[PDB]
Design a protein around this ligand. Structure first.
Ligand SMILES: Oc1ncc(Cc2ccccc2)c(O)n1
Length: 154
């Protein structure tokens, strides 16, 4: 089995919104907004909920742009992350207990201070190409295996 997660990227013509995760798993890396999908909500509802909780933002429409499956060695559940994009947003991004939001120019994405997988899949995100990814990690720093392909349906 796998555990459902959400990841949301606010991608505008000249900038992308990321949040510095301040506590919990992966703290100290810039990341999209998201987390675990709960019982009683759709995946898209969970994505909106996490975006709202972490940044204060609401959105008209989220678009499905990818799926990334993560294996962490020694962890029995695969993590099935559903990736979403939006261009337009409602509200001003504000800091939460979990996340400190900042806009980045598309040529200044801080990949060295992001999850290592992002280097591989972000360019597909920026090109508006839908994708399926798989990454096996040993801890939080080392990618042992991975696959990445473009898909017609996410
Ligand atoms: O972009 C990006 N890549 C990897 C992670 C780590 C992760 C955490 C929870 C479930 C799956 C993966 C992440 O949070 N963000």
């Amino acid at each position: 089995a796998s555990r459902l997660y959400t990841l949301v990227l606010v991608l505008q013509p000249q900038r992308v919104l990321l949040g510095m995760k301040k506590r919990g798993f992966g703290a100290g890396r810039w990341n999209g907004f998201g987390g675990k999908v709960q019982e009683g909500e759709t995946i898209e509802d969970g994505a909106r909920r996490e975006l709202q909780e972490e940044s204060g933002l609401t959105v008209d429409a989220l678009h499905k742009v990818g799926q990334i499956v993560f294996e962490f060695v020694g962890e029995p559940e695969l993590m099935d992350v559903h990736v979403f994009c939006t261009d337009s947003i409602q509200g001003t991004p504000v800091e939460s207990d979990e996340m400190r939001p900042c806009w980045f120019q598309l040529d200044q994405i801080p990949f060295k201070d992001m999850w290592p997988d992002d280097s591989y899949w972000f360019p597909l995100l920026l090109q508006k190409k839908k994708f399926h990814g798989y990454f096996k990690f040993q801890g939080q720093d080392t990618i042992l295996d991975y696959t990445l392909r473009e898909v017609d349906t996410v």
